[PDB]
Design a protein around this ligand. Structure first.
Ligand SMILES: [Mg+2]
Ligand SMILES: [Mg+2]
Ligand SMILES: [Zn+2]
Ligand SMILES: [Zn+2]
Lengths: 430, 429
């Protein structure tokens, strides 16, 4: 029996749903070999109050336990198994676990309905991402279109066609992919801001995503809401956006805490690394898993009325470089790039922080490329004051045009060829 | 609801199960725009006896109805949408209600080896729009097996990573096409693992009739230590329509589809015999199909089988059009496949290709230095014996037809990144 919004009236009430669940979570976690060995020969936690002294679990811990070190149920109870790479990180779930995952993804403020046609444009190979959105789509009755991603069967040009031919109403993909699909739509002679009348909402992740960029993504696609969530390949969705544009931690389904690496202290709000304890996760229990994302958590109430804290994802701990006498983050640079007028059509850029200089490149059309570079330079002088070298690049330099238009199909392996057929197509990959 | 084995005791009761269902199938079918237009003005079929006069539905029709010409329910009732791309032109769309999916997953789960909660099931077929990966995954979930979504042609999941998963997770079941069975075996060898010994948990490999001769199927099993290679028959639009029993025969799932044999020389349909495979699914609300011609050449037998499955059997003979003349004989890929995989397993010949010329059959294959020249000579003798065809055979070193990097490259996943440190490589972008 999982709680849903409305089942609590104040922060105190929500904190009690969390505490009444903690002993079940601790006792379940102690059944995995990892926690069993961590507390071997020691007194283990049992009570909601024992939770305050529990040591963090790191991403390195999960890697060290490949494949089933974190398993707390018999394999017969497992529904799916997943991996993410970067030394694989294994995760797995019962079917009851999957109901919690599906409901957390389905908490989209735009809703998901049977009248929806939901294009799932994230990978299905080993990682949970595509499966999660598909599970959520099926839970709410939406028509799921499995686009996959990084799949030779489904290049951008084909997704563009499917978006229009099937009157897709909801999409799921990362924010960089939202601009890739837009670049691909234009290469097909389609306009993302008006030629897709059925599209009503685009779901996406905190790739760290600034509000500047998020609103530009919406405007590229004609003003449709871009609904951001925060999650990881190991946890599924842990926060989702409200209509007021804030991301609310799903604290009715996990205990969230903020970790300070210098002091070693855990805190309920403030700035630090995101630490999570899922409450409905029997197969692979996690006690204070440190996602190692730099976040800021606030308990201020939001005008949307959802009585849950909110979170800002400021990046992965360490993505802060120095040039001249100042700190340069990807987030701050991203704001300046996507503060350029939409008419410049600057979507794709990259930068390298040298000790003496920030090297930034972007591709843009000929008409506005020079003035985009001077304006971006002046924005850097104004906002960061760091020395810089900016190069406007021809279109297709960072994002090849072929990638936007290439068609490619899965063809059945062939062994006997006729004259006029290239038998080099028998050369096998994958 | 839907029948299960044990719900009929004879061919007569099975036929009664089908004919009882046909009227509802017909009325459902005529709700789609395609079948409504086929009968516009004319009187519609209604009874099971009316079914005999129904014209075929073709692959071209399905392609002409892209995307929703065949739809017979409101969009809200659809669970999933799928398409398969052809050589060129439009794709072939298909789509299913949630209840349709129950019939689909039950048909796939009709595996004589079973699918159990104790299983770890590596699904190694594409999830990109086609049904194939979703079908295997739905059946694994129906039967409680731990599903491992390998995907295929996916950039997340190269062969090297599948080999690690097969070994490290003690995978007990796989689903992939027959070429991928040998690709995985070559990748396992490349990683120093013996497909025939080092995977003790693997108990069956499910695969489809990618024109699969018995000679090749037996060698695929032998390569993986003799574990069953369980063939099924279906299409990306139908799902599984027939499955193997332990006797090695493929049994049509006649309790959920009416199957007929089309003879193009007469235009007539039969229950048995040799001809083109026609199928009418009986539990398919969203996209009903009346007498859909797969156009594969098959032979259907009603002779009982000692496995216990009271269902007719089908042999898939191939597809018309693959008629290659060399010298004075005809050469088919299936006959060449039999000769190639008739070589002794110790030669390790798994990958081959051939070009048919009027004056020569040019055949090439991969094999290790130790057995390469002997393989070519035996194969050249085999072509003389069985086909009498002029030939030129070139054995190749490993890595020629299947490049070694395909077998061992690891290719991570990674994320988009925009700001790079002084030392990092920003051509990722
Ligand atoms: Mg299981
Ligand atoms: Mg629907
Ligand atoms: Zn809010
Ligand atoms: Zn049988």
């Amino acid at each position: 029996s999982r709680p849903e919004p409305g089942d609590w009236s104040s922060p105190a009430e929500l904190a009690e749903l969390q505490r009444a669940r903690l002993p079940q979570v601790i006792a379940q976690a102690l059944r995995s070999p990892f926690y069993a060995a961590r507390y071997e020969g020691r007194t283990p936690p049992r009570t909601a109050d024992d939770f305050a002294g529990v040591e963090l679990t790191t991403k390195q811990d999960l890697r060290d336990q490949y494949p089933f070190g974190m398993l707390a149920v018999e394999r017969e109870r497992l529904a799916t198994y997943h991996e993410s790479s970067g030394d694989p990180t294994a995760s797995y779930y019962t079917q009851e676990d999957w109901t919690d995952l599906a409901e957390r993804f389905a908490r989209k403020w735009t809703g998901i309905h049977p009248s929806d046609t939901f294009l799932v444009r994230t990978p299905y190979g080993l990682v949970i991402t595509g499966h999660l959105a598909q599970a959520a789509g099926r839970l709410r009755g939406a028509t799921v279109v499995p686009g996959d991603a990084r799949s030779l069967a489904t290049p951008l040009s084909r997704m563009v066609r499917v978006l229009k031919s099937l009157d897709v109403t909801l999409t799921w993909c990362n924010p960089t992919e939202i601009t890739m699909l837009a670049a691909a739509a234009k290469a097909a002679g389609l306009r993302p801001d008006r030629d897709f009348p059925a599209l009503r909402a685009m779901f996406t992740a905190a790739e760290p995503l600034t509000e500047v960029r998020r609103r530009r993504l919406s405007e590229i696609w004609g003003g449709v809401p871009v609904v951001e969530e925060y999650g990881s390949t190991e946890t599924g969705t842990i926060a989702g956006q409200c209509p007021e544009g804030r991301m609310h931690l799903w604290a009715d389904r996990a205990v969230f805490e903020v970790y300070d690496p210098a002091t070693g202290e855990l805190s309920e709000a403030g700035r630090g690394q995101m630490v999570v304890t899922p409450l409905y996760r029997d197969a692979m229990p996690l006690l204070r898993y440190n996602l190692a994302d730099e976040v800021e958590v606030s308990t201020d109430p939001c005008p949307c009325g959802w009585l849950l804290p909110t979170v800002t994802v400021l990046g992965r701990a360490g993505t802060e470089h120095t040039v001249g006498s100042a700190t340069v983050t990807q987030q701050r640079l991203e704001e300046l790039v996507f503060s350029l007028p939409a008419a410049y059509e600057v979507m794709f850029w990259r930068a390298k922080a040298h000790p003496d200089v920030l090297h930034l490149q972007f591709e843009a059309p000929d008409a506005t490329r020079e003035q985009a570079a001077k304006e971006l330079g002046a924005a850097l002088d104004r906002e960061l004051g760091v020395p810089h070298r900016i190069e406007g690049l021809p279109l297709g330099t960072l994002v090849p045009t072929e990638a936007l238009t290439a068609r490619r199909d899965i063809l059945k392996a062939r062994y006997l060829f006729a004259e006029g057929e290239d038998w080099d197509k028998a050369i096998m990959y994958f």
